[PDB]
């Protein structure tokens, strides 16, 4: 997701993170086995350095792995 402007209000250096998505990370609210969205198997988000460690750890424990990290600017 290309940042239109600095997403976060609170300010630090921001880094774009592209992740391969497990069904768990974004389960659809559907009956049966939850499916992540087809259109994005690789969600990309913008994160502040402070949040970067929590975001990565949560991504890690869920199936999906970091495809790439890029500084948001």
């Amino acid at each position: 997701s290309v940042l239109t402007g600095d997403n976060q209000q609170r300010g630090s250096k921001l880094f774009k993170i592209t992740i391969a998505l497990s069904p768990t990370l974004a389960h659809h609210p559907w009956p049966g086995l939850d499916t992540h969205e087809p259109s994005q198997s690789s969600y990309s988000t913008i994160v502040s350095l402070e949040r970067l460690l929590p975001e990565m750890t949560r991504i890690k424990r869920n199936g999906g792995r970091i495809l790439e990290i890029t500084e948001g600017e």
Binding site: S1, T4, R10, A26, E37, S39, T45
Partner: protein, 273 residues
């Protein structure tokens, strides 16, 4: 307790009064020091409006003290209907959402995140809304922004206690009510060192949030239906935290921000700390 009649045979609005009983007020007909029955530490009476003044003065002139007064009509009302929260409904914000769908999410988010509480045109956040619908922000991320926003802080966090703010938070971010005294204690400590932003972050970041409505689903009420690792009492606490439809979390009302869940009730579900 339940009150069986709203009004006395002679017309007169009954009012339930709750006091802490004192040995003088009622005592066993026994030898030795007078003792009130332990079970009635908090006694309740329904009195007509006429005798209310006399009743209350007498209570107070003894060592009694009044816990609260409440009109009998509000009392002896049905427990709120759970119809709308038994099955929440749920909103998904697809990618390539058309204009209307994005609008629906937004509305739904404001509803759940703020309680019934009304958000005025000036209060509403264009910037955050802007981001959603040209991508860039997840529903999850919008939700974070709302809880960061001053609007949120002014209603929930700046008026009431941090004790109250926690459960207030639980309900908005997770349908659940809080289970156990520990959860309340953990959040309080988080807030003291990390501050307000970190605490808000810890509910959205939590896996319980992720497991249900993890991304791109507006939060819905999980409580009122059976959840994993949820104390049975939590379900009862959900009835205290959630009063009817068209009942809100309002700083505005007299003594607006108080605790729906008594501290003792939390202790029952679990103790340890």
């Amino acid at each position: 307790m339940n009150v069986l009649t709203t009004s006395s045979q002679r017309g007169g609005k009954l009012f339930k009064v709750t006091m802490t009983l004192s040995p003088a007020l009622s005592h066993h007909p026994w030898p030795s020091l007078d003792t009130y029955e332990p079970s009635q530490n908090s006694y309740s009476v329904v009195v007509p409006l006429d005798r209310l003044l006399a009743e209350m003065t007498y209570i107070k002139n003894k060592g009694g003290r009044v816990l609260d007064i409440s009109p009998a009509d509000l009392e002896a009302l049905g427990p709120p209907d759970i119809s709308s929260v038994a099955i929440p409904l749920k909103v998904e914000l697809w990618a390539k959402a058309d204009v209307s769908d994005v609008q629906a999410a937004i509305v739904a988010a404001y509803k759940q995140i703020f309680g019934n509480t009304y958000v005025l045109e000036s209060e509403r956040l264009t910037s955050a809304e802007s981001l959603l619908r040209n991508g860039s922000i997840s529903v999850r991320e919008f939700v974070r922004l709302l809880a960061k926003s001053e609007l949120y802080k002014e209603r929930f966090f700046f008026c009431t206690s941090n004790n109250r703010f926690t459960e207030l938070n639980f309900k908005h971010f997770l349908g659940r009510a809080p289970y156990n005294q520990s959860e309340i204690a953990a959040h309080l400590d988080r807030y003291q060192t990390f501050g307000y932003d970190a605490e808000i972050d810890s509910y959205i970041d939590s896996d319980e949030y992720i497991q249900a409505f993890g991304e791109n689903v507006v939060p819905y009420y999980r409580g009122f239906k059976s959840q994993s690792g949820q104390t049975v009492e939590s379900f009862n606490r959900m009835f205290k935290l959630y009063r009817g439809d068209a009942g809100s979390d309002t700083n505005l009302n007299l003594q607006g921000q108080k605790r729906r869940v008594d501290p003792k009730n939390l202790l029952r579900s679990g103790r340890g700390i």
